[PDB]
Symmetry: D2
Subunit: 310 residues, 4 copies
């Protein structure tokens, strides 16, 4: 058995050789995860407060931005720190009422503003390709932490009896092919024409390409993403008239998940371009999101090009 802390020390080459700093960052995340885990066994504010407090206590983060706050949070006494963290404290918290998987998503960037000064929104509006780390905690049948710093995706499972996260998968990679699609198909009529055509494509009979595909939609970004990463597949959250530019948050959800997806050998697109290369406009900016096996995301992109209407 190898714990998360031991694994970090082992891979002192990742995170720009900043091992001590990564240990601190993930220790704050693991602490918040443990607190949230027990609390699950409203919660949004709770998770937000605990994670925020955990990060501030490590004296390594200058400030944070959260889906649960309109404005960024500048930590007093941490202006010397060079890291900022963006997070979705409790992804899909609505699933708590029905005992369905929920999760925490985090994204880490090196600040751009001068150290020793208060971080500004400029530090939080960098494109996803600037992330130095990203990950999620999935609170399902078991609690797991998955992260990347640009050198592969690593998975750890929390052992409640030992109170520690244990390594369970060092190099998480999408399988060569995907055969599952995840989307709220009930909203079929509301989706762009290209997405509707792709859904029909998924239902055709073609054994040579494993079609029709299997459908799976838990309704939790983290849970669906996690399953598709392990078994192969694609997750889709298109735009609709109600959400013309998508529903998912570009900064708190799309970017970190896109970083993880790419590090696992997958693709993350908004239907037309690479998520990680999008220039952020606002903290709460939304974006259409298609992520998973590259061939599947490529198919969605093709259908959107062939049937451009919304």
């Amino acid at each position: 058995m190898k714990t998360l802390g031991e694994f970090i020390v082992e891979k002192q080459h990742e995170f720009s050789h900043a091992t001590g700093e990564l240990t601190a960052l993930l220790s704050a995340i693991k602490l918040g995860a443990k607190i949230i885990h027990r609390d699950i066994n409203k919660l949004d504010l709770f998770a937000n407060e605990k994670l925020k407090a955990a990060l501030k206590a490590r004296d390594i983060v200058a400030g944070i931005a959260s889906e649960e706050e309109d404005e960024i949070v500048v930590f007093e006494g941490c202006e010397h720190a060079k890291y900022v963290v963006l997070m979705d404290p409790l992804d899909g918290s609505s699933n708590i009422d029905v005992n369905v998987s929920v999760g925490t998503i985090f994204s880490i960037y090196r600040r751009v503003t001068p150290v020793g000064t208060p971080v500004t929104e400029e530090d939080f509006l960098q494109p996803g390709n600037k992330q130095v780390a990203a990950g999620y905690v999935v609170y399902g049948s078991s609690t797991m932490l998955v992260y990347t710093t640009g050198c592969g995706v690593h998975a750890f499972t929390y052992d409640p009896s030992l109170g520690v996260f244990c390594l369970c998968q060092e190099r998480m990679r999408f399988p060569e092919k995907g055969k599952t699609y995840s989307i709220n198909e009930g909203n079929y009529i509301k989706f762009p024409n290209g997405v509707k055509k792709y859904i029909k494509f998924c239902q055709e009979e073609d054994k040579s390409t494993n079609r029709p595909y299997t459908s799976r939609y838990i309704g939790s970004l983290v849970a669906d993403f996690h399953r598709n990463l392990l078994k192969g597949g694609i997750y889709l959250y298109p735009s609709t008239a109600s959400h013309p530019d998508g529903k998912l948050r570009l900064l708190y959800e799309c970017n970190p998940m896109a970083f993880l997806a790419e590090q696992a050998g997958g693709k993350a697109s908004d239907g037309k371009e690479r998520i990680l290369d999008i220039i952020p406009e606002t903290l709460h900016q939304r974006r259409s999101f298609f992520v998973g096996n590259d061939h599947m995301v490529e198919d969605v992109e093709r259908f959107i090009r062939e049937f451009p209407d919304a």
Copy 2:
């Protein structure tokens, strides 16, 4: 706070006033659930063995039938018992690999054969309407036990820190209307014509009836059933050319879930008739299954009558 054990003693009117016996039965189930819970934090055989051992140790069950065994199990030294239990020890165990919800389903009947003799398959082939109890354990973000003895559906949540199941919902009831459907829509082309038509019906635009409906499919009978019970909805597992008479087991899955559904004010059909009234043919008999809010199941039945082809 009120524990499962205390609740049972409180409702000494249920289970034909056989309080001591119900306590014994659920104690065996709770024990097995606790063991399985920790083991999750292959498993099929494990869950089967632990539950079987737990039931035998309570000296109240003459024998059991399990999805994990071709033949029934007659407990030596328990021929004096008048109860038999049928179970699906670990529903959707495949979801374990992806950290998705799994569950245990149990069904209890009073034997028909003379006490003091070895139970036979006759005791396990009674129609669902003869069940004296049924329930499930859902191992999700939290572990919960749900059951009925014919007087409503009661829910309990396991508190790992106290090692006990606590009452969380005394009268589980489907809401007045459902607005969510759960099916592997990827297999659309393989389903009977009536089911295909119903799926399209679910996607129409009609705000007056909350359409289009929301789609949710975890891929776990227990997990999807549980969510739909709390929020309203319908779960569908139709027949296909590969499984002409459905995939779900009539005795280990359909009957117990149908009993729970009806006790919560819902409906459980195979598309044409009431699940609980079907006369069992074999231990492993399969059946098409549609369960949830009555109006939704009624709609499926109508579409099947209007479009009868497979």
Copy 3:
């Protein structure tokens, strides 16, 4: 592995064949123990309230008497019950501050007053020889439950990860000889002359009788008793000028521990007579207490006869 509940069902010959009732009684105790266990990982009132509530919820106890209450507690709606329980909810609670072992002690009697009426102090003032059950829960490095119903002493260890008590010792018996004594020797000068002489006797050099004996005094009746039961020894709590008739409670501590000691093959005396045969005078009556290996208790009794002064 065999759980406490399964063990009880197995030994349906004990407790006057009242298996269902014993299960109920110990279930209340185990529940209270679990609650207290987690709360430890002031407390007196807490432990008292939780245990009292647990016993009342099982609808099998007419009332209780506790070291934490001047008057007995008559449970409304339980006048039909035939059992009464006396308890020391949190023995040696002062040890909590220093992380030292503490414990719960319980004693069970069949009421003497007519069923269907409110129990009176008469039901709680019966001599110890009338106990139908007695036991303790020791909250130490691990939490254990030990009990007897007149057919030997059985020990169970709580497994926090499974949330259940597991059998660890079916027939607890004092070894053939004891070689350890447990007393607050600091109060040597305050003890009766016979006790002082016995202490000196314990310190003599005589390998043939394993002397000098080893001294061990945790300061917790339950913890010291438990160790001496497993390894052999004697526990002494004599009278002093401050407590002329002893400090320990005859009904809440001495009687239940004496029942356990005798069932394990040991002896329990007040220095002159058998604890279980003493006729109670009041609910809070105190008594000198010497318990453990028979030969050691016999030695104390001899010294008290030979040196009678206080």
Copy 4:
């Protein structure tokens, strides 16, 4: 609430400002403690192996010396490390069988031999006054970690439900006076004359100095030490004919506990001189040990000077 990890980061002035290193060291200890904690809820080898593995995995310790090994252990690939650790993996493991408190003791030194080379016994034979850190983990009714780096004694309690150690006492100090003594008084006749005289002194009647003192002897160095630190007192483990120079290990037990005692305002002597100033002769060297409130240890020293015979 403040965790051990957060506390360490907070006090970045201690441990020669080597915060990152202290975090690593205590993380290894906390991990081992968690593993041992669950294993308790033979063990000597287990505890030794887990702690040794934990320390090696942090890549910060060049090697260790343990009471469970005749020779020191040089960690391959850690010759670059500048710290060495000495430990008593499972103090009083015999108490496990009786559910009595046990503990882990650790001592940390900066190596004296050149970095980049294999540590030798020279690195492990430094006097106690050279320790840079020392501490213990007490596995009792609750699990606690206590440590010092020369700036006071800090206590933390393990919360099994959160899987983390929480600060509970920042500045542990002996009370102004002690009124409890801890010794195996059964061996009175075997002790040096001065110790026998001190024991009698403890039993005299003198309210002005809180005498007679209370006696408490759990039989576990860590447990007795911990209680005396919180409530005041003295722990004595004298020499005897069987152990002419004491029984406790100078390096694995006496030195670390002496460092803690002094940092809490107490005293630690072998009866004649300061434990921390003794020049080690061998890895397994033993020593008489008297530790606790200064006035009490001073009294023992006086009696030993006044009655010098063994």
